[PDB]
Amino acid sequence: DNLMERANSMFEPIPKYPPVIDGNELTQAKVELGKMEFFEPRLSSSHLISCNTCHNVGLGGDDELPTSIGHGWQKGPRNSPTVFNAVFNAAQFWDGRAADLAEQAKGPVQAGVEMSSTPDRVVATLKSMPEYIERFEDAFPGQENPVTFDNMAVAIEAYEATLITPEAPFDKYLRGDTSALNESEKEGLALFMDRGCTACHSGVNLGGQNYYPFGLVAKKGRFSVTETASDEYVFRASPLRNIELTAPYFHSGAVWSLEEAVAVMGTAQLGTELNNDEVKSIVAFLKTLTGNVPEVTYPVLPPSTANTPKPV
Ligand code: HEC
Ligand code: HEC
């Protein structure tokens, strides 16, 4: 009743359709082409990696092992965020200097198309296959040279926008089904809002909207969340939606236990102190954020040809 009213003033349920990003209107042809690309391993120089490799849509939309590659990354290994509902995050996954945000940061959907392979190799690869040319023509009617790096990016972004998970028990609760959550989960919800977690984890994805100078450190357990030295480094407050499916946790992916993840975020400095029973209650609540994984028909990709660059 009032709890439901409070929850609704702090959060929102996943809608049936995704918000249009940068005026990219979704169409069947764009989404279909974007899906082919999402699963296309030949965009990588080795031909062994595709988006699905690190954002497995059948296993939480992310990667189980920290990686040092992808998106032209040139530093140490980092955990991969889930592509599920990423379209609703204004901030993107960040594991670096606050000073670099201004010029290097962008929306999740857009960060998603930052590639390690060069535009030339990618375009040449796609143009080497008749079927891809036809798909680009279907997706971009009216364009004489439809196969471009920018159009590839637009198609992938259209597909990314469709990777949303509606109908989680919590969303049903927000929409009025008071029985969608049991008493144990409702206590967790009340505590999530009463212990101040909402200062950083709120809105449609319960996080993902701002950066903070607080990150996981290897000092319950052998971990803790502490402020970075001189606030030099910042992290995006994690969107907690579907957290049940997205282990391991934090920028480093060092935590596998959801209970531990909740515990290290309860601190005096953040004004989020929790006792063991409350940690368990919040865990119960967070498990109600799992939505319906979108159905995916595995795309049948076209065969390579003499002009298709060879695996390197
Ligand atoms: C592993 C080698 C990866 C491959 C291949 C792709 N991605 Fe990825 N992605 C990876 C990591 C480690 C990260 C965070 C690091 C950083 O570079 O951003 C990401 C991030 C994203 C995001 C951002 C999600 C958010 O901020 O909420 C998206 C939407 C995303 N990745 C999409 C994406 C697509 C569409 C890819 C194929 C073109 C792709 N990634 C490949 C690791 C890896
Ligand atoms: C802002 C100052 C925060 C407050 C208050 C809370 N959290 Fe948080 N959380 C924040 C950040 C910047 C991060 C990422 C840190 C990093 O090292 O990567 C997180 C992360 C989490 C996670 C891990 C989620 C994931 O990887 O999917 C969980 C489970 C989490 N936070 C829970 C949580 C709870 C229950 C809180 C109230 C006690 C809470 N957070 C407060 C920032 C902030």
- 37 and 158: one domain? yes
Quote the CA–CA distance of 101 and 98 in Å, as a whole number.
6
- 184 and 160: one domain? no
Beta bridge partners of 203: 11
Q: Is 238 in the pocket of ligand 2 (CB under 6 A)?
A: yes
Phi, psi of 30 (to 5 degrees): -70, -45
CA of 264 to the centre of ligand 2 (A): 8
Report DSSP letters for 112-146, one per residue: TT--SS-HHHHHHHHHT-HHHHHHHHHHSTT-SS-
Q: Are strands 223-227 and 233-236 parallel, antiparallel or unpaired?
A: unpaired
CA of 266 to the centre of ligand 2 (A): 9
Known binding positions for heme c: 51, 54-55, 71, 78, 89, 93-94, 197, 200-201, 216, 236, 250-251, 265
Atom 39 (ligand 1) nearest CA: 51
- 151 and 248: one domain? no
- 132 and 185: one domain? no
Phi, psi of 175 (to 5 degrees): -75, 0
How many independent structural domains does the chain possess?
A: 2
Note the helical H segments in the chain.
2-10, 28-38, 51-54, 101-104, 108-111, 119-127, 130-139, 149-162, 169-174, 183-194, 258-264, 276-286
Q: Which residues fall within 8 angstroms of residue 237, CB to CB, at 6 or more apart?
A: 91, 200, 201, 207, 208, 209, 210, 211, 212
- 156 and 30: one domain? yes
CA-derived radius of gyration, the chain:
21
- Let me know if 293 is exposed, middle or buried by CB neighbors in 10 A (0-12, 13-18, 19+): middle
Q: Is 251 in the pocket of ligand 2 (CB under 6 A)?
A: yes
Pocket test for ligand 1, best of 30, 35, 54 (most atoms within 8 A of CB): 54
- 38 and 129: one domain? yes
Quote the CA–CA distance of 282 and 241 in Å, as a whole number.
13
- 149 and 228: one domain? no
Which CATH number belongs to the domain containing residue 149 in this structure? 1.10.760.10
CA of 140 to the centre of ligand 1 (A): 25
Active site residues: 114
Report the structure determination method.
Answer: X-ray
Pocket test for ligand 2, best of 197, 267, 287 (most atoms within 8 A of CB): 197
Quote the CA–CA distance of 236 and 101 in Å, as a whole number.
11
Atom 28 (ligand 1) nearest CA: 112
- 121 and 45: one domain? yes
| Residue 86 tokens, joined | 């990423």
Q: Is 200 in the pocket of ligand 2 (CB under 6 A)?
A: yes
Q: Please state, as a whole number, how many other Cβ atoms lie within 10 Å of the Cβ of residue 47.
A: 17
Dihedral of CA 112/115/120/122: which sign?
A: negative
Report resolution in angstroms: 2.2
Quote the CA–CA distance of 306 and 128 in Å, as a whole number.
8
Report DSSP letters for 47-88, one per residue: S---HHHHS-TTTTTS-SS-BS-STT--SS-BPPPP-TTGGG
- 145 and 170: one domain? no
- 91 and 135: one domain? yes
Quote the CA–CA distance of 134 and 24 in Å, as a whole number.
20
Q: Is 112 in the pocket of ligand 1 (CB under 6 A)?
A: yes
Please tell me whether residue 230 adopts helix, strand or coil conformation: helix
- 136 and 55: one domain? yes
Q: Is 108 in the pocket of ligand 1 (CB under 6 A)?
A: yes
Known binding positions for Ca(2+): 79, 246, 248
Range(s) of the domain holding residue 230: 1-16+165-292
- 172 and 275: one domain? yes
How far apart, in Å, are the Cα atoms of 187 and each of 32, 89, 93, 242? 42, 27, 30, 19
Beta bridge partners of 234: 96
